[model samples]
Target: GKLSEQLKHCNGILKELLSKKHAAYAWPFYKPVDASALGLHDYHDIIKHPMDLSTVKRKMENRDYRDAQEFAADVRLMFSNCYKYNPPDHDVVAMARKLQDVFEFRYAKMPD
Candidate 1:
């Protein structure tokens, strides 16, 4: 009973530190490291994938990174938002013309 009681006390204090799911993982953030504090690493032998919603995130992951579908949805929404904000004036900038080029590139028919 004493062992179980001690474990519960330690866990409560740790949880308070993160207030995030798996807050237990955050303790290492305080330690020194030779790499980006929190960045993508080779996982399952896959090379160069961002760890946050970009590869994952720096500092730590929050509620958003845990769910792949939700992250995908959020990224898609950002793209849609950009599209919604297309240059309103015909006197377009380079970025506006770049967007036009991208649209043409996407719809251009390619020979099989």
Candidate 2:
């Protein structure tokens, strides 16, 4: 049960998000966002586009509820992505390091 608590947390987050009105995709969408035929890292970008992510950056510039909401959503998806295979993945973490970069750049001290 090393990952038992984390599993519960992941499932709870997915439940909460999917239960939301605006969630576009469900937990199933966490499945292979890349069909291989498409390419690598091919998944639904919930926060896609320059304008979209620029707004995210602007929104997250402050450590308010808005930033909390967006960060929660992104990390939940990241956890879900890893949950597909398993946890504590070195490779998956390596891929998501940039996510950490943005988060740290903004709220390394307070955002923790």
Which prediction has the highest lDDT against the true structure? Answer: 2
Q: Which candidate is the best by TM-score?
A: 2
- C-alpha lDDT (0 to 100) for residue 34 of candidate 2: 44
Model 2: per-residue lDDT, tens digit, 21-111?
3233333232334435545343444423212222333334443323344454555455445444434655555444534344344332331
- The lDDT of each candidate is 0.33, 0.39
- Worst 10-residue stretch by lDDT in candidate 2? 47-56
> Candidate 2 has which clashing residue pairs, if any?
none
Steric clash pairs (candidate 1): 50-55, 51-55, 51-56, 52-55, 52-56, 52-57
| Candidate 1 local lDDT, 20-70, one digit each (tens) | 542343332222221334352322233222121222232123433343333
As a whole number from 0 to 100, the lDDT of residue 36 in candidate 2 is: 53
Residue 16's lDDT in candidate 2 = 44
